[PDB]
Design a binder for these strands. Structure first.
Lengths: 49, 46, 138, 180, 45, 107
DNA sequence: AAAAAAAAAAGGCGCGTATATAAAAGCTATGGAACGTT
């Protein structure tokens, strides 16, 4: 895929544990390439290294 | 369910602002599915 | 610290960066050490000199240098962001003089010679062009 | 003179008097952050008051990022409770002001080189390195970080007046080493 | 980086100015008498 | 003799037991006489000025080095040379009369 | 002629410089030891 997504909002809960970053950005917009505003976007991401 | 399943490589914060770089993930948003190649997320913790 | 002490006391202009290029001091512990050493010597007991050194290092004539001298002399009385680490002010006065003249020492060579910002010079030059009023001797 | 060096920050350590489970706090707490490979310190922040909790494995919690003493204290009392909110028997113990960081402005450039030649017992200007000047007053034990723009930054304090009282005794010297 | 030019400079100079052909540490063992002061008493001199 | 020296012997002193366990020494360069004015300029130095101010009619020396890191086995200022007057390297060496006068230097 | 692509950089903040506190948790080096080693 080639789509570029951009998310910007307010973070209320960040959590890091064993290279697992969890973000919950409240009222954030998802910019496809059509920007989708997500009030509650669960972000769970790990280390890619 | 508005869940971003990706991998973070860069998050920089300056006392009030996030700059999160997410790479090679899959995002499902409200009866829609989206997968990106790069993701640049800048949250704001009050 | 004592080397800069000697140079300042005997009226010799020396850059912390030059001194550090001589000696690995990490420059921050050097700053603290020079502070404490100056205070110690004050207990135990004037920035124009830098101009001609750089004038020479760039190969500049003596009338150019005295034009820069008068410019720097007025720099103190021309707050309006006058100095705030006046090494930048000295180098921008030099740039003013060369631009007043027709010398092919364009900013690249001077910056790479004096290890200065290529941008702080034009940042000073912005206010320098307004300040141009009080700089014409002859 | 008469310029109040506004406290740019106030630091405060509080000891929970316990031993948490660092992995437990990372998974359970919400405004919590803690990375082993970098530094074993829990990065806990609360939106009101906006400070940081430097929670270590030994219950040493540091409150930094407020501008006043009580905000660095109120956040701590909230900080302890949210740790208790995890499910631990944490206790708000041993609160103390750590540091008061502060800056001010005088609206006139200062002859720091003038400050350094006569008050070299007290001044330190590094124009090639630091655009300010370090003027450490012994009594009170306050450091005046004295900028050419006029920024007199003051820190190394736990007393609010100590920052204030030191400046009142230093402005005439800056007027001594002033330009206009 | 860190080459003592003063070595050559001062060494040459001192040797000329005194004429002790040798080393600056060589006081008498150095051969002396070279490098006098150019008698300028009279053009022909 | 002086010209011969400063033109050949100088070099062949270097192109000798020069390289060091690696560091190389190359072309040697000789400037015209100058002074490093104390805390200030470096500039040409006519003999007259040298005589009056007790300076030394000398020239700097520059030699080219190549640092060489061993890599699996298996330009640079130096000193300052006094100049004989009217040697090929002296300012006067070729000047004419009227200049000599202007330099306050008896023909 | 016209679309689309290929690619330099400009300008902005990188953080970074120093400056100053204030906090002990991986690492360093100092500081202490005297008994294994000829």
């Amino acid at each position: 895929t080639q789509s570029k997504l951009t998310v910007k909002g307010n973070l209320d809960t960040y959590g890091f544990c064993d290279d697992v970053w969890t973000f919950i950005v409240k009222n954030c917009q998802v910019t496809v390439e059509s920007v989708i505003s997500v009030d509650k976007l669960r972000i769970v991401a790990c280390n890619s290294k | 369910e508005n869940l971003m399943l990706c991998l973070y490589d860069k998050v920089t914060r300056t006392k009030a602002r996030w700059k999160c770089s997410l790479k090679d993930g899959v995002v499902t948003i409200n009866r829609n599915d989206y997968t990106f190649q790069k993701a640049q997320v800048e949250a704001e913790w009050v | 610290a004592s080397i800069l002490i000697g140079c300042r006391r005997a009226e010799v202009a020396r850059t912390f960066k030059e001194i550090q290029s001589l000696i690995h001091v990490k420059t921050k512990e050097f700053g603290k050490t020079l502070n404490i050493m100056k205070n110690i010597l004050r207990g135990k007991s004037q920035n124009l000199t830098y101009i001609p050194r750089f004038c020479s290092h760039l190969g500049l004539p003596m009338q150019v240098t005295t034009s820069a001298e008068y410019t720097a002399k007025k720099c103190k009385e021309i707050k309006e962001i006058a100095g705030k680490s006046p090494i930048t002010i000295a180098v921008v006065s030099i740039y003013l003089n060369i631009l007043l003249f027709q010398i092919p020492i364009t900013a690249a060579k001077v910056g790479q010679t004096l290890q200065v910002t290529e941008g702080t010079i034009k940042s000073g030059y912005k206010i320098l062009y307004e300040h141009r009023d009080k700089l014409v001797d002859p | 003179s008469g310029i109040v060096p506004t406290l740019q920050n106030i630091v405060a350590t509080v000891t929970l008097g316990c031993r948490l489970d660092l992995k437990t706090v990372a998974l359970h707490a919400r405004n919590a952050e803690y990375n082993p490979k970098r530094f074993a310190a829990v990065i806990m922040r609360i939106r009101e008051p906006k400070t940081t909790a430097l929670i270590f494995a030994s219950g040493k919690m540091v409150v930094t990022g407020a501008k006043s003493e009580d905000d660095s204290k109120l956040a701590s009392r909230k900080y302890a409770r949210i740790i208790q909110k995890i499910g631990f028997a944490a206790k708000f113990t041993d609160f103390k002001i750590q540091n008061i960081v502060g800056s001010c402005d005088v609206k006139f450039p200062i002859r720091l080189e003038g400050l350094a030649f006569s008050h070299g017992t007290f001044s330190s200007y590094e124009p090639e390195l630091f655009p300010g000047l370090i003027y450490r007053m012994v009594k009170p034990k306050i450091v005046l970080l004295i900028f050419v723009s006029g920024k007199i930054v003051l820190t190394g304090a736990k007393q609010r007046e100590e920052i204030y009282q030191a400046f009142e005794a230093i402005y005439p010297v800056l007027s001594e080493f002033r330009k206009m | 980086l860190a080459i003592n030019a003063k070595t050559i400079t001062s060494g040459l100079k001192y040797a000329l100015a005194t004429g002790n052909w040798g080393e600056q540490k060589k006081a008498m063992s150095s051969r002396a008498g070279v490098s006098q002061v150019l008698n300028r008493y009279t053009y022909s001199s | 003799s002086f010209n011969q020296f400063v033109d050949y012997t100088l070099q062949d002193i270097i192109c000798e037991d020069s390289t060091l366990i690696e560091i190389s020494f190359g072309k040697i360069y000789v400037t015209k006489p100058m002074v490093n004015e104390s805390d200030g300029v470096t500039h040409a130095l006519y003999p007259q000025e040298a005589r009056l101010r007790n300076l030394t009619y000398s020239s700097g020396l520059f030699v080219d080095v190549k640092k060489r890191t061993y890599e699996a086995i298996d330009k640079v200022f130096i000193g300052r040379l006094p100049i004989m007057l009217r040697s090929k390297n002296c300012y006067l060496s070729e000047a004419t009369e009227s200049d000599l006068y202007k330099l306050k230097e008896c023909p």
